[PDB]
Amino acid sequence: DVQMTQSTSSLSASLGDRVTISCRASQDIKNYLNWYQQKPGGTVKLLIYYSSTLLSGVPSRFSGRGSGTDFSLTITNLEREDIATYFCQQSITLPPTFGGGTKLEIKRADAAPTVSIFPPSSEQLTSGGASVVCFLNNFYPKDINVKWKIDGSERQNGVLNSWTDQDSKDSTYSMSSTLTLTKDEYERHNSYTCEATHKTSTSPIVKSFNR
Amino acid sequence: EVQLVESGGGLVKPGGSLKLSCAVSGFTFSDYAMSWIRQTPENRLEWVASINIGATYAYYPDSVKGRFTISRDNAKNTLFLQMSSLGSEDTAMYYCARPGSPYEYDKAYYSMAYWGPGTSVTVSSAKTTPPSVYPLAPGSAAQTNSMVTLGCLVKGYFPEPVTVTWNSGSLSSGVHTFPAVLQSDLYTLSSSVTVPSSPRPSETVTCNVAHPASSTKVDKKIVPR
Ligand SMILES: C[C@]12CC[C@H](O)C[C@H]1CC[C@@H]1[C@@H]2C[C@@H](O)[C@]2(C)[C@@H](C3=CC(=O)OC3)CC[C@]12O
Questions:
Q1: Do B47 and A97 touch (CB under 8 A)?
Q2: Is B61 exposed, middle or buried (0-12, 13-18, 19+ CB in 10 A)?
Q3: Whether residue A113 sits in one domain with residue A50
Q4: How many CA atoms within 13 Å lie on the side-chain side of B80?
Q5: Same-domain status, B78 and B131
Q6: Using the beta-carbon criterion (under 8 Å), do A176 and B112 form an inter-chain contact?
Q7: Structural domain tally of chain A?
Q8: Which structural domain range is residue B174 located in?
Q9: Distance between CA atoms of A24 and A18, rounded to whole angstroms?
Q10: 3-state DSSP: chain B helix, strand, coil percent, rounded to 5?
Q11: How many Cβ pairs closer than 8 A exist between chain A and B?
């Protein structure tokens, strides 16, 4: 199979910026290379087919070019409706293969995370389990680290993190760290701390509580 | 205009069978060679099956060949994909797609110009399990201030997805629902909502979590303390 290679999986840019996505084929596919666009929970859309032919409805600020083994997709005036994942695809050799995709981020100003810590609920305690949740919402850039300390002592066992894709309204990110314990080990301790290190503050944002 | 809608997706056991459907509109179905393409949990697009006009020839990659079968009903405007002997590697979002042109001399012929929303196939021996929903309320002296964040913990369910709304959708702004993490073959995600400290506890915020797989709906009113 012809291998489709996009050299970066993530790309960052500003509104009004010239974006360029590269795509390399392991073989000569001549001009048979298409470009697709796909938003997070959405359908796949054809942008350009053959090497540089736009599909109806696609803005002229999208342009493709390349022949043989090296292709590229250029966006001229990045708009926030251009924040999607872009795939390259060869249509001439069986089986037809796609590239890994290039997810395009948008740039904005630095935002500090709003940190909120929550204790286990009486309902979950009722089940012999106990999860401490921490929300770190609306921050930029995406680079952030979290530290859990149970009675001054760090901890990574039982900790789980999840991230949101870039927000549509404010282009920020959000994260959730959940320290799950056993009801019993939860009660042989008093204090629980949620620490956030971010490009903004120099000193962590600390959210703690105790029983 | 042009419509493609996949159907038949669901939860299957390894080695099991499933049949998919694609109803079409806005074009002469009988003029096109129709295909199936799947997207992988790793966001990886892969070809599945192709069929020409007249259902005379069908193309399958070595990944699906000998197990899947593509067919068409030109009178019903429907395309099918019989899947058999399924493995976990077949877990994916399956789409039906239409080429850009029925004419091989047109370069749009070598492109898929229309896809459907897709239908989800999960091949697992794991069991359909309803979610437990826990209220996340602040505690216990930090009542400051401008805004307050509430949340709902949706825990130990299978399969995906779970739908989470706040106040029956009345609360759209300030909502953050996170991707589920797998843990003991059971999913867990979290949802946060931010409201002025004025409309809470005064006035009500409640999380509504729907899990269609187990036909479950849970309403969790967030109460102080
Ligand atoms: C199924 C098909 C049509 C019948 C003919 O016998 C050739 C086969 C194999 C090759 C196959 C065509 C259908 C066409 O729709 C294709 C799927 C078409 C492609 C579109 C595409 O994106 O990649 C290929 C070019 C050719 C094609 O790959």
A1: yes
A2: middle
A3: no
A4: 11
A5: no
A6: no
A7: 2
A8: 126-223
A9: 20
A10: 5, 50, 45
A11: 126
